[PDB]
CSV table of C-alpha atoms in Angstrom, one decimal:
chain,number,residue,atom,x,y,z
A,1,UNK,CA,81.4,25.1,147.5
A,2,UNK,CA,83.0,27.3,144.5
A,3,UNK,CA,80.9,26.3,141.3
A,4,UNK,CA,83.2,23.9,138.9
A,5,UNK,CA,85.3,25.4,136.5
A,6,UNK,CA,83.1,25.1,133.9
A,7,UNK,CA,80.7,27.7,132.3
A,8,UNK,CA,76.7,27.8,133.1
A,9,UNK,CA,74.7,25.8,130.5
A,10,UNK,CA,71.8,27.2,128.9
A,11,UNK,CA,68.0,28.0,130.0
A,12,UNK,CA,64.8,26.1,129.0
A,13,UNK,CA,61.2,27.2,129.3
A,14,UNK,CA,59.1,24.8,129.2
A,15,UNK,CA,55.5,25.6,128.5
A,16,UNK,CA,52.5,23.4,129.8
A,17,UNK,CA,49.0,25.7,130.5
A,18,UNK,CA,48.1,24.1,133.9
A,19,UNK,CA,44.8,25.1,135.4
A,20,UNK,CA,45.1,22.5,138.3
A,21,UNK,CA,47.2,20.4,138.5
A,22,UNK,CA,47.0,16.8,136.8
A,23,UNK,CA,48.8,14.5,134.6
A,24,UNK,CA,50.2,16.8,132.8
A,25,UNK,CA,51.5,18.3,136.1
A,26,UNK,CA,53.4,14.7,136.9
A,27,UNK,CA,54.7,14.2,132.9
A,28,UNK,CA,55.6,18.6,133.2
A,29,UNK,CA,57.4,17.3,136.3
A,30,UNK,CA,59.4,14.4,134.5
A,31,UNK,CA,59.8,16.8,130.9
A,32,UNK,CA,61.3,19.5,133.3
A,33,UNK,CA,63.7,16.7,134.8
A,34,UNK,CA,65.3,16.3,130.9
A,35,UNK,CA,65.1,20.0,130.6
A,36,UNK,CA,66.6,20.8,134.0
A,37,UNK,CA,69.3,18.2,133.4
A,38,UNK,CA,70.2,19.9,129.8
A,39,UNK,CA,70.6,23.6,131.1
A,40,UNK,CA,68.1,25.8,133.9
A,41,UNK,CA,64.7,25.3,133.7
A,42,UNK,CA,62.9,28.6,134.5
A,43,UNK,CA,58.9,27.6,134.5
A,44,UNK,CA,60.1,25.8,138.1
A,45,UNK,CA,57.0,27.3,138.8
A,46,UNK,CA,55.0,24.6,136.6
A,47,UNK,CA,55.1,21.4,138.0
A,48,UNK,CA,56.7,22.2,141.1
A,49,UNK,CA,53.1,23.1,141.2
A,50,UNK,CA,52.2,19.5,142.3
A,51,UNK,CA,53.1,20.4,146.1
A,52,UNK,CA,50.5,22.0,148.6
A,53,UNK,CA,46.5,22.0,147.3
A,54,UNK,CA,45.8,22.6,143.3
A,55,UNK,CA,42.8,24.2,142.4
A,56,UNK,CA,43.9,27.4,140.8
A,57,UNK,CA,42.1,29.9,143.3
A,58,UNK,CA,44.6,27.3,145.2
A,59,UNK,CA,46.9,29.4,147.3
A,60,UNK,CA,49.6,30.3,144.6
A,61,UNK,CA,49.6,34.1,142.8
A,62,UNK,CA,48.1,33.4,139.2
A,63,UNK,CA,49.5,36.9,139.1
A,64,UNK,CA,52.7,36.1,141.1
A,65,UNK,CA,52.7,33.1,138.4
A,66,UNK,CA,52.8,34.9,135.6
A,67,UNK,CA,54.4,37.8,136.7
A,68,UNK,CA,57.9,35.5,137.1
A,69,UNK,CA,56.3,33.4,134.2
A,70,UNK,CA,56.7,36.5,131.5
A,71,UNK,CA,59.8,37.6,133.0
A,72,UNK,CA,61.7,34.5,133.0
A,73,UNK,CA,60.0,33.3,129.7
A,74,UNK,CA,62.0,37.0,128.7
A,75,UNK,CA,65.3,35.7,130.6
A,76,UNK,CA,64.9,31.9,128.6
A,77,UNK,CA,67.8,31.4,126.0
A,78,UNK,CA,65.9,28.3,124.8
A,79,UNK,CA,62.2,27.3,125.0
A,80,UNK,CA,59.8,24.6,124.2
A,81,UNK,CA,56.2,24.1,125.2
A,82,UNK,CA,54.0,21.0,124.9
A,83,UNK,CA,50.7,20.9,123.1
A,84,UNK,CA,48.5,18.1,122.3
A,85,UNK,CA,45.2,18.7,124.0
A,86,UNK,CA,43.5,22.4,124.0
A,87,UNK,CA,45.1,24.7,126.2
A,88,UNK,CA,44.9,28.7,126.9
A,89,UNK,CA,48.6,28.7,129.0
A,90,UNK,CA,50.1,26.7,125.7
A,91,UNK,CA,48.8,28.9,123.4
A,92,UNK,CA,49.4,32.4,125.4
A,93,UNK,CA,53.1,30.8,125.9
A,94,UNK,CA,53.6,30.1,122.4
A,95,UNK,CA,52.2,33.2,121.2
A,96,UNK,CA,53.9,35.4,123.6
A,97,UNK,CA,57.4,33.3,122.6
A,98,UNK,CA,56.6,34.0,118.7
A,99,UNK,CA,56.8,37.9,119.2
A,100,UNK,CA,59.1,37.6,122.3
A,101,UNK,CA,60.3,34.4,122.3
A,102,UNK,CA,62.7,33.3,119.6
A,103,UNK,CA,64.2,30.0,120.1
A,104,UNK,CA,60.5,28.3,119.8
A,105,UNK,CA,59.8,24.2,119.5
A,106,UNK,CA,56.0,23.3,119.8
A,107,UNK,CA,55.1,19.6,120.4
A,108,UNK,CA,51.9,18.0,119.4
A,109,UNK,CA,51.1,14.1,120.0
A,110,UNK,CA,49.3,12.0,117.5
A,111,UNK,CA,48.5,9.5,120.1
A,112,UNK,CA,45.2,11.9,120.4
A,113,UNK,CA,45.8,13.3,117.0
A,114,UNK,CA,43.9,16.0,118.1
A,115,UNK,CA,45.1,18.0,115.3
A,116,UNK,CA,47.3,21.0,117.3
A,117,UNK,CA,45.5,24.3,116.8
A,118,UNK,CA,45.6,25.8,112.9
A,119,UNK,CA,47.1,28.7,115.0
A,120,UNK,CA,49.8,27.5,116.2
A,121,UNK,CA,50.4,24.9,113.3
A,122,UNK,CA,50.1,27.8,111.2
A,123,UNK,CA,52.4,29.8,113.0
A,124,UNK,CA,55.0,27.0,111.5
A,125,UNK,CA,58.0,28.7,110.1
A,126,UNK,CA,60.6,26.8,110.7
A,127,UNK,CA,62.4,30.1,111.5
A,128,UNK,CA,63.0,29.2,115.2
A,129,UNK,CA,59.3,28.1,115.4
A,130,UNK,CA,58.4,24.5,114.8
A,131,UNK,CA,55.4,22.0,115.6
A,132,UNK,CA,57.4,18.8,116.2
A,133,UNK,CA,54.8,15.4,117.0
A,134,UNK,CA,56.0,13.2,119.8
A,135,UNK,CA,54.2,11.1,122.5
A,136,UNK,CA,55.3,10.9,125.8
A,137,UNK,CA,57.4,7.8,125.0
A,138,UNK,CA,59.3,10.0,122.8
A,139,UNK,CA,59.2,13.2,123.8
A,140,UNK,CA,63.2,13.2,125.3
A,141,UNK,CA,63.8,12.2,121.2
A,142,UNK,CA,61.8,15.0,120.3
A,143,UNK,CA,64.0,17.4,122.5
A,144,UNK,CA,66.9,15.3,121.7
A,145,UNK,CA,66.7,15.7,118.0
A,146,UNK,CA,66.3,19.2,118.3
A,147,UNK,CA,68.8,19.4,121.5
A,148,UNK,CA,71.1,17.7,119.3
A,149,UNK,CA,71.3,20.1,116.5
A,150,UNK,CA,72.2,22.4,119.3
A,151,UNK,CA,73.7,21.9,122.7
A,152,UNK,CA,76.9,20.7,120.9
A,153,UNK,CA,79.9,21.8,123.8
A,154,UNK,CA,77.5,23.4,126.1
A,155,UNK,CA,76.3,20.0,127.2
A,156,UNK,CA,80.3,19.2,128.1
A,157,UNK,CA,83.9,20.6,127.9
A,158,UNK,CA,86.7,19.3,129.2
A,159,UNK,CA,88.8,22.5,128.3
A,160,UNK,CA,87.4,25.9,129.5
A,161,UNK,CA,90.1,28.3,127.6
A,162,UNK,CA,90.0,31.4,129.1
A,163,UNK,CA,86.9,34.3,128.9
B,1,UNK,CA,25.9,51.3,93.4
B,2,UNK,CA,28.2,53.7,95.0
B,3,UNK,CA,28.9,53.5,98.9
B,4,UNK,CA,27.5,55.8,100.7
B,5,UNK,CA,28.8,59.3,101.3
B,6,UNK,CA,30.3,57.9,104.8
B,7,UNK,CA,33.6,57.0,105.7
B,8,UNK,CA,34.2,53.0,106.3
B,9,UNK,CA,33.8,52.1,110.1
B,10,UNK,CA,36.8,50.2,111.7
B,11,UNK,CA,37.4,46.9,112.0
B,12,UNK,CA,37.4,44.3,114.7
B,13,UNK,CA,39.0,40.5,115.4
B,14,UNK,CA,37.3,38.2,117.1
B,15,UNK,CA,38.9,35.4,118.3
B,16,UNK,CA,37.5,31.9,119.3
B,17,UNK,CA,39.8,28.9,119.4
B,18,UNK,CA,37.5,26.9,116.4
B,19,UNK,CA,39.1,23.3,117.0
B,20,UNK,CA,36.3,21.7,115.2
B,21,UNK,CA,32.5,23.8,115.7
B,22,UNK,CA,30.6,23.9,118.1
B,23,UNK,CA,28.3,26.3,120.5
B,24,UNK,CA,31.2,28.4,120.6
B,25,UNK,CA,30.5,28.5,116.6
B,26,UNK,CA,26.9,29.3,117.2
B,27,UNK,CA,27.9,32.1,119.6
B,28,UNK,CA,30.7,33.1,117.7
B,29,UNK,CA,28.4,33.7,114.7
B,30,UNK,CA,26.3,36.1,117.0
B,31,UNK,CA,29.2,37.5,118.9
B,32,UNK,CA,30.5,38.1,115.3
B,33,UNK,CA,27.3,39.8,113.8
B,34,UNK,CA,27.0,42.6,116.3
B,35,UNK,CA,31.0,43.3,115.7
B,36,UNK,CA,30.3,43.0,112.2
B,37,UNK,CA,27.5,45.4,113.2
B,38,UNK,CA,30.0,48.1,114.9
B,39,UNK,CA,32.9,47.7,111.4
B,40,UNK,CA,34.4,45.0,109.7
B,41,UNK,CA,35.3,41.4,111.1
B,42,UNK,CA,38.6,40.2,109.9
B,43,UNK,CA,38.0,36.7,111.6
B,44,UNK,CA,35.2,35.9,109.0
B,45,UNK,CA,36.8,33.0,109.0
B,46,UNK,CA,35.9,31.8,112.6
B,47,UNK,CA,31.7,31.4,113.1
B,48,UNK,CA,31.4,31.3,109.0
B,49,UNK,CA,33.2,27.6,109.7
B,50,UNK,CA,29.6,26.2,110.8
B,51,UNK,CA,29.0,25.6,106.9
B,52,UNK,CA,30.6,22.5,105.1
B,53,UNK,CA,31.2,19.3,107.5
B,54,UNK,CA,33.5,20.1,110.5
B,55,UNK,CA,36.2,18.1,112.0
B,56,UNK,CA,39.6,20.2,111.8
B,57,UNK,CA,40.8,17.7,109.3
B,58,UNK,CA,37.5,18.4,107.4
B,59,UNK,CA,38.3,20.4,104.0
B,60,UNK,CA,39.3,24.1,104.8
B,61,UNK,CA,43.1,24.4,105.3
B,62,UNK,CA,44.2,24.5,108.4
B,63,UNK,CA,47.2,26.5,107.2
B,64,UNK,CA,45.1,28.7,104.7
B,65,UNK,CA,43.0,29.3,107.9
B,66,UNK,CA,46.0,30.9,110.1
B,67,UNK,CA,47.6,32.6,107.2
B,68,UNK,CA,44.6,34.6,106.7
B,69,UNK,CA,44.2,34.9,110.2
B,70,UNK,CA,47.4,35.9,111.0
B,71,UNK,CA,47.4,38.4,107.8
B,72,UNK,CA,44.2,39.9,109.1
B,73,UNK,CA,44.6,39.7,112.8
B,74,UNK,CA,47.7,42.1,111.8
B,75,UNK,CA,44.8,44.5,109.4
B,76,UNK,CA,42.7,44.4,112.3
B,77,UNK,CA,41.9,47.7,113.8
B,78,UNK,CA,40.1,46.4,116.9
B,79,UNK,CA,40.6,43.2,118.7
B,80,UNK,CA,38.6,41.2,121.6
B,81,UNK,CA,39.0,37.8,121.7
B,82,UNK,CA,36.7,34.9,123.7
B,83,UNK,CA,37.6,33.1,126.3
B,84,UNK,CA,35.8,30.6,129.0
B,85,UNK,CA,36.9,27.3,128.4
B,86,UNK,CA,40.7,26.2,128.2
B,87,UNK,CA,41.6,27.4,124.2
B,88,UNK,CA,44.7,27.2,121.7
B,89,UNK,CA,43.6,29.5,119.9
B,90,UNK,CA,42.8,32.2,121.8
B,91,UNK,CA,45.5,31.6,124.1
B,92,UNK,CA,48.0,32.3,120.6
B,93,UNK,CA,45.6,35.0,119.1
B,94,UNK,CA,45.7,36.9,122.2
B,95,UNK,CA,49.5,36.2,123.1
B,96,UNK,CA,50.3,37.1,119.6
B,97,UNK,CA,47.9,40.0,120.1
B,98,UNK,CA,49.7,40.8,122.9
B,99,UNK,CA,52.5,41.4,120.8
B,100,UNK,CA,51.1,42.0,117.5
B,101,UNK,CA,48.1,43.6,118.5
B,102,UNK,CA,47.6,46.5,119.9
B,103,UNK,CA,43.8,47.6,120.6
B,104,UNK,CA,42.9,43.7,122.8
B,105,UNK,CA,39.9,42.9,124.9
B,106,UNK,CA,39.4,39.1,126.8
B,107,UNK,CA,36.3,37.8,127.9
B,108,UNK,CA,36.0,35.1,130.5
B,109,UNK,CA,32.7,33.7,132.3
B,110,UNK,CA,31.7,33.7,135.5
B,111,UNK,CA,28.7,31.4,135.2
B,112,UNK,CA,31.4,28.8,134.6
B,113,UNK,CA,34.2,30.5,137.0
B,114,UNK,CA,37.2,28.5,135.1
B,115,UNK,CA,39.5,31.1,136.0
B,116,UNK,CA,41.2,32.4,133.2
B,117,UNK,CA,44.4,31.2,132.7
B,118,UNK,CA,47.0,32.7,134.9
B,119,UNK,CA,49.0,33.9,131.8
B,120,UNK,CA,46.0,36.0,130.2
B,121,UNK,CA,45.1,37.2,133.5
B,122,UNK,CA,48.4,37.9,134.7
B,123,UNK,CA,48.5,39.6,131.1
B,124,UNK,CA,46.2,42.2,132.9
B,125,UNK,CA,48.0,45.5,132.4
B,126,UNK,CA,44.6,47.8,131.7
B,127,UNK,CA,46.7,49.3,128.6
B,128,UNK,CA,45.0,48.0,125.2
B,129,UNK,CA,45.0,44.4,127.0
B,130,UNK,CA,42.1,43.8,129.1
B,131,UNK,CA,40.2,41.2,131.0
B,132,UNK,CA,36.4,41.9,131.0
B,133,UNK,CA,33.9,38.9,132.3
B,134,UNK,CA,30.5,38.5,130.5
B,135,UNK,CA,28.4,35.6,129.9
B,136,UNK,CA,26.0,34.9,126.6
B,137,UNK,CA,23.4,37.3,128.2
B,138,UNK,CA,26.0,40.8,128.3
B,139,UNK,CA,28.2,39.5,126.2
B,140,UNK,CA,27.0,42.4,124.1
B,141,UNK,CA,27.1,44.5,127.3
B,142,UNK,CA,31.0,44.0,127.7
B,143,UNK,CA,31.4,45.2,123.9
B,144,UNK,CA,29.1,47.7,124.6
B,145,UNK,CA,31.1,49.3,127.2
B,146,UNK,CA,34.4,49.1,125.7
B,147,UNK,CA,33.0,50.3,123.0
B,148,UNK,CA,31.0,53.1,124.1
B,149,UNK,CA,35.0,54.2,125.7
B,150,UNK,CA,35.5,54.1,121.7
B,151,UNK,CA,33.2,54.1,118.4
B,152,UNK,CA,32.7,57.9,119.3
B,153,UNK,CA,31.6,59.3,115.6
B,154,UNK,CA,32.5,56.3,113.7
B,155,UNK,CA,29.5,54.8,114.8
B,156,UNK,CA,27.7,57.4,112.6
B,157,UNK,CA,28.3,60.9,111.5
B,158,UNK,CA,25.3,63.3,110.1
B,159,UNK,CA,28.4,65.3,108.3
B,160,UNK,CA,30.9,64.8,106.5
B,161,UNK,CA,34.0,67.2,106.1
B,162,UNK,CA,36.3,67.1,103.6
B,163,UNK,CA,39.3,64.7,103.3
């Protein structure tokens, strides 16, 4: 079936170190459903890691992983990642998307207040880059508040005027 | 009095996800002292964090603490960051190293086997960025062999030619 007439949304990475597979998996799973319904969501690879055994050395590629990881991360034309508890993935993502990322929202949740890392609060520049706090009966505000000073006719048009 | 009729050494950053102070802090105070050893540590920061109460929010400035970090990581000659145990911090320090940095060494443990993160590891490329394992007993060792593929005559020099 020929694709609507209407233009391709936008692309959203959404960060979430996982080492395993766990909660976070099952909320990266629901997060990516917002983000998948907004634009593409390239990390499929993170929580659609759920499926078959976790366990890391887990059949999978870590290299295969972030191979398509840092080329789609490269391919994202918007990206967020979620923080709130210590993780290496998180911090790698959001470092790697402050020199090659641009488009950069961080989330920390002060449910734990476990005060995100003086790195990547730091790194706050509010240039692209920002450490917004949200809990995850919140965090489709948090994306909607920043989605909403964005996605203004990308998320609908019922013109499409000619390329 | 005068320094010495020698050159200055170079300079190395350590990183170590702090997130409070710990072990890691005792180690990172040792880990620090024999790169303090080979030039200057930029990260004086990190390890010298043991002093004063700890708790993140405890009095140091989280922001003050990046800035400098981020100021110095960029001065820093030489950089090898820790890793082990899941880490904010030296996920961004060695993303942004990635980017930023040039000259950047990772350590992970096998004694605990947490498999690096897919991103660092997948990071591989064996051109500045490396992934060595070590554990508290070579930890030195690790250094020591990177470094003996380096610190050729800065270690010392006898001579000293005009310039």
């Amino acid at each position: 079936m020929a694709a609507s007439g209407e233009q391709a949304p936008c692309s959203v990475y959404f960060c979430g170190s996982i080492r395993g597979g766990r909660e976070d998996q099952a909320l990266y799973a629901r997060i990516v459903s917002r983000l998948r319904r907004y634009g593409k969501v390239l990390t499929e690879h993170v929580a659609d890691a759920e499926l078959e055994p976790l366990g890391e050395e887990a059949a999978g590629g870590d290299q295969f992983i972030h191979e398509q990881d840092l080329n789609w991360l490269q391919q994202a034309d918007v990206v967020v990642a979620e923080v709130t508890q210590p993780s290496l993935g998180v911090g790698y993502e959001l470092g790697r998307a402050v020199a090659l990322g641009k488009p950069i929202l961080c989330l920390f949740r002060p449910q734990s207040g476990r005060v995100l890392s003086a790195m990547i609060r730091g790194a706050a520049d509010g240039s692209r880059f920002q450490v917004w706090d949200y809990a995850e009966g919140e965090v489709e505000t948090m994306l909607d508040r920043y989605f909403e000073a964005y996605l203004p006719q990308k998320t609908a048009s019922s013109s499409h005027p000619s390329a």
